[PDB]
Amino acid sequence: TGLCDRFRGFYPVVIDVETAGFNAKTDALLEIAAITLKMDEQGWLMPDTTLHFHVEPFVGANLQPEALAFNGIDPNDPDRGAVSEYEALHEIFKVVRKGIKASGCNRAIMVAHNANFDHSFMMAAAERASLKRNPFHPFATFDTAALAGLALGQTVLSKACQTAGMDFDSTQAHSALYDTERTAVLFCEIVNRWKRLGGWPLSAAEEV
Amino acid sequence: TGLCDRFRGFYPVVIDVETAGFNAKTDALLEIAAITLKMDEQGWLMPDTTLHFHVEPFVGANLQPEALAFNGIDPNDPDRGAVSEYEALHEIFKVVRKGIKASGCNRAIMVAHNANFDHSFMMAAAERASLKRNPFHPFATFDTAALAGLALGQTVLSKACQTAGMDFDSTQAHSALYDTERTAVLFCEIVNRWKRLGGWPLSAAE
């Protein structure tokens, strides 16, 4: 019932980002949140550490007007308390390496909703910041859209959360932190329900 | 218990590709396979139609030597019976639109192992070929690597298959068709076991 036993050594970290466009290479990263997970002694999955940052657009970044209109972010607001991509990711990576070591995992895997999008932005930013020893798997993810499709028959984040019996506040949907917390709770519910119903561990089906 | 009921109107199509590199935009697509699924009257998911193609590298495509050494494909072998991207994808889309209509779904979703990779090559090929009305969802996929992580505690395709009690012949692992059918059987087993254990329908638990 160890975390390192559950996903062959993968240390799941929930991530979500807000951006200034669809291109991870050319468009600014504006917000990022991260939530590590942990298992109790019974093997139940739950949130561990939570981090969140407003991010300053990198030098040379494009800002698509439509993206800003959609997510309501204004990068030029001096009161938004933004930090550099380096500062945000350096802190996220530090927390993630420590969790990996403490739990005996060997690598982090990003958990996200339509994960590739968030993955590409995080990797692009870590590249720009010249971050060393990125604890994240280069291409593997846990896409909660697919997972929710299987478990709940829904792929839209809000609908999936509702179908899971969770709350979901539309006014907070453009916040990386809010999205990340909802996504983490969803993911945990799905993994936990699977265990509860006797799908994990694999031995359970025959016992009792 | 209809297929259209299971994934909010999404029509899952299992896809796998073999390529000549890691870059979907610049590298050739060399093989593609597709397997549509169907649900019987009791709502059990299974393979329906199977398609498979050797693909001619598009004009101006890069061929990474390492990729050819890895997958063992020789694009210049005239006996490999290759077709153009247009030919392959046009036939797949045709079969997919037909399945979508018959089952009452809205759109297809790609099912693949580490789906983004296969998705990006398929989409880039569909673009190069100027295909009309791509039935696939522009960004949503069902990644069996993540599903096998949930269902089986394994993310490697071979190991996940074996953990699921499936056979897996490594000597065939570089065939898109082979990978696609194993992936399809894995996906079906995962959806099906979820149903059998009382996870679906949502009402079943009570």
Three-class DSSP category at B58: coil
- As a three-state string, the secondary structure of chain A is CCHHHHCCCEEEEEEEEEECCCCCCCECEEEEEEEEEEECCCCCEEEEEEEEEEECCCCCCECCHHHHHHHCCCCCCHHHCEECHHHHHHHHHHHHHHHHHHHCCCEEEEEECCHHHHHHHHHHHHHHCCCCCCCEEEEEEEEHHHHHHHHHCCCCHHHHHHHCCCCCCHHHCCCHHHHHHHHHHHHHHHHHHHHHCCCCCCCHHHCC
The verdict on whether A137 is a catalytic residue reads no
Residue for token pair 């657009």: A57
A19, two tokens: 């951006």
**How many C-beta atoms lie closer than 10 Å to residue B67's C-beta?**
18
B178, two tokens: 């082979």
The rounded distance, in Å, linking the Cα atoms of A19 and A116 is 14
DSSP state of B136: E
B108 touches A at CB < 8 Å: no
Does an H or E element contain B142, and which?
Answer: strand B136-143
Residue for token pair 């991010």: A55
Please state the length of chain B.
206
**How many C-beta atoms lie closer than 10 Å to residue B105's C-beta?**
23
**How many C-beta atoms lie closer than 10 Å to residue A34's C-beta?**
29
The rounded distance, in Å, linking the Cα atoms of B9 and B101 is 11
- As a three-state string, the secondary structure of chain B is CCHHHHCCCEEEEEEEEEECCCCCCCECEEEEEEEEEEECCCCCEEEEEEEEEEECCCCCCECCHHHHHHHCCCCCCHHHCCECHHHHHHHHHHHHHHHHHHHCCCEEEEEECCHHHHHHHHHHHHHHCCCCCCCEEEEEEEEHHHHHHHHHCCCCHHHHHHHCCCCCCHHHCCCHHHHHHHHHHHHHHHHHHHHHCCCCCCCCCC
Task: For residue B201, say if its preceding peptide bond is cis, omega within 30 degrees of 0.
Answer: yes
Which listed residue (B54, B119, B137, B174) is catalytic? B174
The rounded distance, in Å, linking the Cα atoms of A158 and A164 is 10
Three-class DSSP category at B13: strand
A4 touches B at CB < 8 Å: no
A34, two tokens: 């991260």
Q: How far is CA A136 from the centre of its chain?
A: 12
Does an H or E element contain B53, and which?
Answer: strand B45-54
Question: Which CATH number is A130's domain given?
Answer: 3.30.420.10
The rounded distance, in Å, linking the Cα atoms of A7 and B67 is 28
Three-class DSSP category at B45: strand
**What residues does A19 pair with on adjacent strands?**
A29
Q: Of B81, B134, B88, B78, give the one whose Cα is nearest residue B107.
A: B134
Domain count across chain A: 1
- Which residues in chain A touch residue B150, judged by CB atoms under 8 angstroms apart? 142, 147, 150-151, 190-191, 194
Does an H or E element contain B130, and which?
Answer: none
Sign of CA dihedral A141, A205, A2, A45: positive
Three-class DSSP category at B155: coil
Please state the length of chain A.
208
Q: What share of chain B is helix, strand, coil (3-state, %, to 5)?
A: 40, 25, 35
**What residues does A53 pair with on adjacent strands?**
A32
Write out the binding residues of B: 16, 18, 174, 179
The rounded distance, in Å, linking the Cα atoms of A182 and A148 is 13
User: What is the identity of the amino acid at A57?
Assistant: P
A51, two tokens: 């981090």
- Work out the widest C-alpha separation in chain A, in whole angstroms: 61
**What residues does B13 pair with on adjacent strands?**
B36, B110
Three-class DSSP category at B16: strand
Method: X-ray
8 Å CB contact between A16 and A179: yes
Per the CB < 8 Å rule, is B193 touching A200?
no
Residue for token pair 């060399």: B30
- Give the closest of B146, B159, B202 to A143, CB-based: B146
A181, two tokens: 């917390």
CA atoms within 13 A of residue A205's CA, in its CB half-sphere: 11
**Which residues constitute the domain of residue A14?**
1-208
Three-class DSSP category at B143: strand
Å between A147 CA and nearest CA of chain B: 6
Q: How far is CA A171 from the centre of its chain?
A: 20
The rounded distance, in Å, linking the Cα atoms of B138 and A155 is 14
Nearest CA in chain A to B165: A202
Mutate to test the interface with B, among A8, A118, A150 (most CBs of B within 10 A): A150
The rounded distance, in Å, linking the Cα atoms of A18 and B113 is 27
8 Å CB contact between A108 and A135: yes
